[PDB]
Symmetry: C2
Subunit: 339 residues, 2 copies
């Protein structure tokens, strides 16, 4: 018996990744964040951000949550917002697909379409969404907040208090390592805080895609983001406020091909069809398990479903255009017994 | 710690439906079957069907599960099949949502689209899938089973053993009524059996869409269907083997407009974007609560997500073409 969809956020199960476990002589588990009602890991941050703004009086019923995202954050924020009586203004580049605009719109998000741009530009959708929030605060009686996922540390706080404690509880205190990729850094940094408080010997690893700066920074102190990735929701170019004070014990740079191989074999072999960040994360978990050696328990995050990436990540034509692997089963008939 | 994705099937939570509850003076809950790993209620039957075939020695790794389905059954079956080392051959009517077809192909189902046809026609998807299972059985050494959801009563058994017991447990024995719509009838008949074993004066209702024959059967003794519904996964014209011996205490016929009004209001007011059958179900729940009177606990099923029918059920152009309401927030 639960009072709203909000009580179904979190307490997600750990699923044993069988091929990754067999390969490493470790128990490697993936946290099923896809089983949140918003269908991603962002339900946690979305809940914490909105609850924080409520607690601080910055939102009243009918108020607006502004965020720049395209965008599990948008989905999570809009679901939570509609459950609590708020609205969302999701700032999105106009050049983003009609597919992603429709998933957000379906849930009642009000899209603000703007020209695409890089982070250095003040009209970049992330940065623009902050100034929009400050503007709307004057003409919205019930308030207007910037969710500010990247630099709002209640994001990290969500994983300290929920994710980490669930992992500690569900591994019966036996977790030896945790690995995750970084967008905002809330998941990795927050879960790291939570876990290391329980047992300071737990090892934390970053799993970084090509095109992100964090691997280079943590390993050599260099400032470089070579290459790129088709993965979405991850790949960070600065030390966000959620990343402040955080140092990983290990760091891995995972190419797209290694992530996609894992991801495609997971569908055929384990019935899990997940997003690109899950490919990166599982690859990181395998590497962490190899570094710690056999007889250890590794946990990572299965952040969302692969259905949302179907038109690129599981699209043969797009993948071949990127010189990346293709799902074996999509290329591949029977005589149908009509009459 | 769950050995595979299969262990996350079931133990789904009850979500209080606030508008429905307030309107009726009852606590109305929807069981969140969309939180299954295959994203629908069909994970339960799919798991039971495949496990039963295994126990009977009908499947070995490399074997094939054949099913005629509106889509979700094939999704659940394909997820379970892939986790256990089987293939699926899924027969779907071409009329079903594009998003189900997409999800099927995505999870690795061999997808066979066929024309819509009534059950009297032997090229009906269900009847045709049975003959395909028979054909494939001749040349599949690892085995080929017909999942046969409509008439395979391990479907109903799944709901007797899991769904019903969860509802009883999670309401702390306070549940007074249960309502759901019928495709195969496993959900409604199975849950009703399990609940009525624990408390025989729990009341059960059918929520039936236009185009189904069941409301007319239970209220008049005659299987008669009129009109049509845009809801998918429900709408049955015969007493299937999963419906044998089922009699509801109440039966309601729910028009689409009533279902969609609930569904659309649910997105904006409660943060729940659900499939067509969920609207039919919640409508039923409201009517059951009103028939039972205030201060009761009513449970229904939230079968799957709205995104699974997005191109039709939340599409202004299609809905206008059907003379149906349009979500207000889609300008």
């Amino acid at each position: 018996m639960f009072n709203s969809v909000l009580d179904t956020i979190g307490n997600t199960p750990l699923i044993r990744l069988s091929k990754a476990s067999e390969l490493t002589g470790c128990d490697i588990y993936g946290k099923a964040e896809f089983l949140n009602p918003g269908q991603s890991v962002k339900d946690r941050a979305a809940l914490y951000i909105i609850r924080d703004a409520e607690k601080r009086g910055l939102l009243r019923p009918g108020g607006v949550i502004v965020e720049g995202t395209a965008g599990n954050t948008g989905i999570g924020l809009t679901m939570v917002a509609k459950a609590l009586g708020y609205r969302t203004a999701i700032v999105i580049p106009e050049t983003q697909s009609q597919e992603k605009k429709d998933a957000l719109r379906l849930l009642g998000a009000e899209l603000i379409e703007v020209p695409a741009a890089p982070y250095r530009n003040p009209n970049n959708y992330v940065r623009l969404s902050g100034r929009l929030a400050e503007q709307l605060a004057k003409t919205e009686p019930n308030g207007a907040i910037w969710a500010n996922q990247f630099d709002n540390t209640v994001n990290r706080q969500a994983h300290i208090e929920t994710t980490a404690q669930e992992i500690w509880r569900d591994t019966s205190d036996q977790i030896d390592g945790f690995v995750a990729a970084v967008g905002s850094g809330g998941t990795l940094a927050g879960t790291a805080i939570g876990l290391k408080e329980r047992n300071h010997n737990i090892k934390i690893a970053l799993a970084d895609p090509h095109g992100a700066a964090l691997h280079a920074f943590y390993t050599t102190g260099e400032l470089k983001a070579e290459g790129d990735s088709i993965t979405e929701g991850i790949g960070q170019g600065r030390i966000t406020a959620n990343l402040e004070g955080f140092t990983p014990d290990f760091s891995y740079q995972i190419p797209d091909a290694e992530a996609l191989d894992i991801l495609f074999a997971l569908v055929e072999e384990e019935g899990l069809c997940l997003g690109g960040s899950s490919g990166i994360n599982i690859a990181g978990a395998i590497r962490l398990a190899k570094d710690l050696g056999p007889g250890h328990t590794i946990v990572t995050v299965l952040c969302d479903y692969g259905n949302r990436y179907q038109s690129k990540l599981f699209n043969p034509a797009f993948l071949r255009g990127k010189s990346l692997p293709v799902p074996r089963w999509l290329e591949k008939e029977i005589d149908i017994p009509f009459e």
